[PDB]
Structure formats: structure tokens, C-alpha cells
Design a protein around this ligand. Sequence first.
Ligand SMILES: CC(C)(C)c1c/c(=N\C(=O)Nc2cccc(Cl)c2Cl)n(-c2cccc(CC(N)=O)c2)[nH]1
Length: 349
Amino acid sequence: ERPTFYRQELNKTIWEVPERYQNLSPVGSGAYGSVCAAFDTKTGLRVAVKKLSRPFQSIIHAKRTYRELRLLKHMKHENVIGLLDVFTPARSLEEFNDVYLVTHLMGADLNNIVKCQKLTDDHVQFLIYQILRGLKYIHSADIIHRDLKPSNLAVNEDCELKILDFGLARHTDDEMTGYVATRWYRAPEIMLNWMHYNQTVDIWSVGCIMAELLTGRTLFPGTDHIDQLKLILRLVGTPGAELLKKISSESARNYIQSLTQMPKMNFANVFIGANPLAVDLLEKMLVLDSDKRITAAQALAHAYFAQYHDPDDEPVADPYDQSFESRDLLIDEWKSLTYDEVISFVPPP
Ligand SMILES: CC(C)(C)c1c/c(=N\C(=O)Nc2cccc(Cl)c2Cl)n(-c2cccc(CC(N)=O)c2)[nH]1
């Protein structure tokens, strides 16, 4: 009933996996783990296998491990990554120190698309439609992605798209510094820690992604946090008093008021030649005040997606209990919770 596992070393990491998974090759690595492509001989699928790096080394790691397993086990939607398998070579809780996660392999991400391909407005409609369909689902579970960007969007040959998070890195201060794509898609309220944020950050990211699909260029390629803010405020205008009072960070508020006031620009003169409906949708996503941004559910009903929108096939998630988020436990308690979730996993039929 327990499969047989075999061992191999790949780039200084030992991988111990069931025999069903063959031809493992390294695909990515970071502080939190490593990923290989493989062939699943049981299902005939090409898969990605993520080996978490010392998942129970600390409370933050143990909870992160638990969190990712909880999320992936819940995600059951065409446009969101799902869990094919989860395994450990451990035969008991006492032996349990490693966690491996298995999903559908994707190679191509949206960067591959935007920089190689010439996307028509039809392609842009279909790609952004699928992001929004996925996001409606994710948000319906009160899950916030927070790191939407082209490298976290997998896209196949038929332009079919899935949202994931390939994050093997700590978004450290250094990682968010300078002329870096790690920060270019972030809502300004989270980039600058303006206030307590919510799921609306993800819609800002979608606006940035949609713009870049339309133009082939990064929307806000800031050289640093402040330069990026300036690029943002140039396009969308400086904040009015109503938004300024919502910036609960007094230092951040005081800074943004130092800036000379600027009006929102004409997006038709920015996105020259774009479908007017794309321009209208961008205007509704790229609103500084996150309270006033369009939601994923609202966006799906926008005329730009008339060709794709089916209100009977834009499903919501089952209830997702994230009461664990506010719970403090010891490493071994997070570990046993995680082990229970590994043990209870039922594969997709
Ligand atoms: C889209 C959604 C549901 C918010 C998501 C997918 C995901 N994990 C992956 O997408 N994992 C993954 C990616 C590429 C290949 C493979 Cl094998 C995996 Cl398991 N997520 C995810 C990734 C790393 C950590 C955490 C937990 C945390 N945020 O602290 C979650 N989050």
C-alpha cells in the first residue's frame, strides 16, 4: 500500500520519491525548496515535484509548510494549480521530516508568452479572462494571492492558464529592492505598507499584467520603491484626501503629501490603439483606492470578456477554514497537523 521509494541526489539535494515518478530533472531552487520535472508513469502526466527545504526547521517554516499543503489541497479549479499527489518517505510521525508536493508540470509562463509571442486582443481577452476566473475562485475562499506576476502564471500551447505560486524565495527587503520584477506588479498599499490590505491587491496586479500583454512592456518598471510610486502616480494621479485618510501609516501619508499633485492621465493616449473596452477595464482595475477597484467577480461581467463570460461556469470555492492563521502552535504541533493532511490526501479521480 505504501509505494516503494528510490533515492537520488540532484544538485546537492537528496530526492526520495515513489517509483512511479521517473526522469526527475531540476527546474528551480530557492531557500524554501526545490522543484523537479518528472514523468508520472501511473497517470502518464508530466509533473512538477516540489521538495520543501527543511519544512519543520522553525515555526515560520512549519506553518508555511502546513499553509501550502492546506491551500493546494483545497484548490480545485481549471485556472488554479491543484495537488496531484503529496508524499513523504516517512513511515510514521516520528520519522516525518520531508514533504513533497506534486502538480501538473507547466513550462511556459506568461513571460515566455509576452516576450516571444505577438498576442492579439483576442489572446489578451482569453488570458486575462482566465486569470479573473481563477481569481474569483481564490478570492471566494478568502485567499489573497499577493504575488501575482507573469512568472506565477503557467500557460500552455492552447493559451490555457493556471495561477500558481512558484515562490521558493523569501521576498526579503533586498529581493524587493531596485529594478526588479519582484516589485513591479505590487499594489502601492502593499509596496509601501500604507494600510492593512485585502484581496483587492490582486486586481492591481492583474491590471499591470493586462497592460503588459497589451503593450509588450512592463507598466511600472520602477528603479526602486519611490521611482515606482512616481510612475504609478503619474498614470493614475496623486491621492485625494479621502484615500489619504485611509493611509494609516503616518510616515507614508506624510511622504505622499510631499508630492506635487498630478491628474489621472488619459489611458487612451497611454494604451494607443487598444480596444476601448480594454482601456475601460484597465481604468477600473488601476485605481489607487483599493476600495474602488473592480472585483474579479465584477470584471468577469465586463463587456471586454463578452466572448468568454459564462456566468454558469465561473465557479466559487468550497469553504476554506483558515482559523489556523491566527493560531500559535509549537513546531511539532504544526508538523503533526501537516502529517495528518499528508495522510488524508485523496488524489483527483
Ligand atoms: C495560488 C495559491 C493557491 C495562492 C498558491 C499556490 C501555491 N503553491 C504552488 O503553486 N506550488 C507549486 C508551484 C510550482 C510547482 C509545484 Cl510542484 C508547486 Cl507544489 N502557493 C504557495 C506557495 C508557497 C508557499 C505558500 C504558503 C504561504 N503563502 O506562506 C503557498 N499558493
